[PDB]
């Protein structure tokens, strides 16, 4: 079977230079954002009917999560280095913390499958707003209201049962184009984002860096799956060492600190 070593060599030799990446909340727990894995059940927080009933739970999360609150960690910066080396085809994220773009990965490389706090939309009149526009209220524990119609202004977070963003559809071209799939810090429980793991070609290495073997990687392993189980930062640290990128990662991380 393939090892982590083997995958690192594939990258370092540019045998794989169209890497697709899937990430989840696991990659942002090092940043200090807890993962998942009145509020009547957890899922309520992303349910539109509940939100209309009581938007205060969501907004408490939005306040916790709002850009500026958290800094990207070495996992993000690794993915940024992947981009910088011109190896990243696309990074698909279930996260709504926005730490991918804060790390400096261009929006063309990102698919933010569950939406963004960078923008907002009035729930009544559909007026769009910059996320900065509602920041004061959200942070001041107010529910932001539309100037035009008084309707609740809701971040462009994709709620359960709502259409995934346009850019999600990129998966039809991305996954079959990928010569490596990297899966980081996802339980792969959330469809339809999960089953994307199956959408790379039979020949394509799939590298999981996660606490645990999850999803189709567990039940339906393929010949060239690699599992690096443990802390995600330890995993990436290990990958970066094998890649010989440690000095490049320092340089990058040092440069990027200022922005934050």
């Amino acid at each position: 079977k393939l090892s982590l070593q083997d995958v690192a060599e594939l990258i370092r030799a540019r045998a794989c230079q169209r890497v697709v990446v899937m990430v989840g909340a696991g990659i942002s727990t090092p940043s200090g954002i807890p993962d998942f894995r009145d509020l009547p059940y957890p899922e309520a927080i992303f349910e539109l009917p509940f939100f209309f009933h009581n938007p205060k739970p969501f907004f408490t999360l939005a306040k916790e999560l709002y850009p500026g609150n958290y800094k990207p960690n070495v996992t993000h910066y690794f993915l940024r280095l992947l981009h910088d080396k011109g190896l990243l085809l696309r990074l698909y994220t279930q996260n709504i913390d926005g730490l991918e773009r804060v790390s400096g990965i261009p929006a063309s490389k990102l698919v933010e499958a569950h939406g963004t706090f960078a923008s907002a939309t009035c729930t009544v009149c559909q007026r769009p707003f910059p996320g900065e526009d509602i920041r004061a209220d959200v942070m001041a524990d107010r529910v932001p209201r539309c100037p035009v119609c008084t309707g609740v202004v809701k971040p462009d977070i994709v709620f359960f049962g709502e259409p995934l963003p346009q850019r999600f559809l990129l998966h039809v071209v991305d996954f079959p184009m990928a010569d490596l799939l990297l899966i980081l810090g996802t339980s792969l429980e959330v469809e339809p984002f999960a089953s994307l793991t199956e959408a790379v070609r039979s020949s394509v290495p799939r590298l999981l860096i996660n606490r645990d073997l999850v999803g189709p990687l567990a039940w339906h392993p393929r010949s060239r799956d690699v599992a690096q189980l443990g802390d995600v930062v330890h995993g990436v640290e290990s990958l970066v060492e094998l890649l010989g990128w440690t000095e490049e990662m320092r340089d990058l991380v040092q440069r990027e600190t200022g922005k934050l």
Binding site: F46, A113, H114, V158, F159, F160, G161, E162, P163, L164, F168, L169, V190, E191, P192
Partner: peptide, 4 residues
């Protein structure tokens, strides 16, 4: 449309 693909929905979450």
């Amino acid at each position: 449309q693909p929905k979450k």
